[PDB]
């Protein structure tokens, strides 16, 4: 074992991106580059330094002198952002990189959408109160969210996930706030309060419905 | 051409897994077959291949000794016996063709921990029209601590699949993880015609049909 690629590189969309393996190994084995995209499978894009398998786009290439693997993205498109794996067999083993996470900028924004739910009439009569708000179909995948008791910030009690790409290049993401019944009544309203590249979105909901 | 893992789930450390993959749709006695795994937020990390034939062939430094991969050419089967298990083990298993990667199946995921399982409470989102565009309305699903990943949901025993959206779990300070579907249907359409969250935590063995009712 041994191979060392970068973790990770930025790229404008439609210039060039080279990514770098670079252990041992190479030195006569011969490389594989696997792309993954996240919640997704692995897939060979390229095998053997420069071959490519049928349906990946012509513009991916790679190249490899000894030290080191190159997998190269000619015309950089929003897709190409995922996860790239360098593979090589040493003798009797196989070796992964550490994988290099892409970046592709600069995309188009795209404004949050926010679901807010208030808590089930069927939880509270199981003596919980979970708040549940769903932020979809944003980007860049970077979001902060606050909640609040009527307009008092609350602190303790908010699960939030970090944001995850989505089919359409977009991200989602999720917070949870989780609440006594009494809390849940003894308000006029809660709030998700998500902010987004200094845009805000705030999204209400009271016990009296 | 298709790799199906099966036999992953939560084990406690210093228990045994047998992992198998079923494949088709190719020639499976001409093929190195292998494991790769990859722990959660990690890399890919290699297991162990093995030769059309039986010899096989190494394994990663970090299961020898524990881990065994055998294959049955008549049932076109792939196999990986885990022994001695620790946390360390915790990672989704996938199965893949050939010496170059070419093939990977969807994986199935294994979990090494003291803590024992917990099937989910279940509790409907009730439509709302608020932040949906248009004459529809958004209904849900609320699937709130389970433990481990994963848990799949289906909407009206799969008749409805435009407009889902299930989001990805959180992990809670707790440890235990929810999370929520969503559904987007005509408001035309809110009663006449119902609307069923179909939740099914395989590792507590619980399912939960729950019906999603207007408030």
């Known amino acids: 074992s041994v191979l060392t690629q970068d973790p990770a590189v930025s790229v404008a969309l439609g210039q060039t991106v080279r990514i770098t393996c670079q252990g041992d190994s190479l030195r006569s084995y011969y490389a594989s580059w696997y792309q993954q995209k996240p919640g997704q499978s692995p897939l060979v894009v390229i095998y053997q330094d420069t071959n490519r398998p049928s349906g990946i786009p012509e513009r991916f290439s790679g190249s490899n002198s000894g030290n080191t693997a190159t997998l190269t993205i000619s015309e950089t498109q929003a897709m190409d952002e995922a996860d790239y794996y360098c593979?090589?067999?040493?003798?009797?083993?196989?070796?992964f990189g550490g994988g290099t996470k892409l970046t592709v900028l600069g995309q188009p924004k795209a404004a949050p959408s926010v679901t807010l739910f208030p808590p089930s009439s069927e939880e509270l009569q199981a003596n919980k109160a979970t708040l549940v708000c769903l932020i979809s179909d944003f980007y860049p995948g970077a979001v902060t969210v606050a909640w609040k008791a009527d307009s008092s910030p609350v602190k303790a009690g908010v699960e939030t996930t970090t944001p995850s790409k989505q089919s359409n290049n977009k991200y989602a993401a999720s917070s949870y706030l989780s609440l006594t019944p009494e809390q849940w009544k003894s308000h006029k309203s809660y709030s998700c309060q998500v902010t987004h590249e200094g845009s805000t979105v705030e999204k209400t909901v009271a016990p009296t419905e | 051409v298709q790799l199906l893992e099966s036999g992953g789930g939560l084990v406690q450390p210093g228990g045994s897994l047998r992992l198998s993959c079923a494949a088709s749709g190719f020639t499976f006695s001409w093929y190195v077959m292998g494991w790769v795994r990859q722990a959660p937020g990690k890399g890919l990390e290699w297991v162990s291949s093995?030769?059309?034939?039986?010899?096989?062939?190494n394994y990663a430094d970090s299961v020898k000794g524990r881990f065994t991969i055998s294959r049955d050419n008549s049932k076109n089967t792939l196999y990986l016996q885990m022994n001695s298990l620790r946390a360390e083990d915790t990672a989704v298993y996938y199965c893949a063709r050939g010496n170059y990667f070419d093939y990977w199946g969807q994986g199935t995921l294994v979990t090494v921990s003291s803590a024992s399982t917990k099937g989910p409470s279940v509790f409907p989102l009730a439509p709302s029209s608020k932040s949906t565009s248009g004459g529809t309305a958004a209904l849900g699903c609320l699937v709130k601590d389970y433990f481990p990943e994963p848990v799949t949901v289906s909407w009206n025993s799969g008749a409805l699949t435009s407009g889902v959206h299930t989001f990805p779990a959180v992990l809670q300070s707790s440890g235990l993880y929810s999370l929520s579907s969503v559904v987007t249907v005509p408001s035309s359409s809110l009663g006449t015609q119902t609307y069923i969250c179909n939740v099914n935590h395989k590792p507590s063995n619980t399912k939960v049909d729950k019906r999603v009712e207007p408030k």
């Open positions: 093995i030769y059309p034939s039986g010899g096989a062939t």
């Open positions: 593979q090589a067999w040493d003798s009797n083993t196989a070796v």
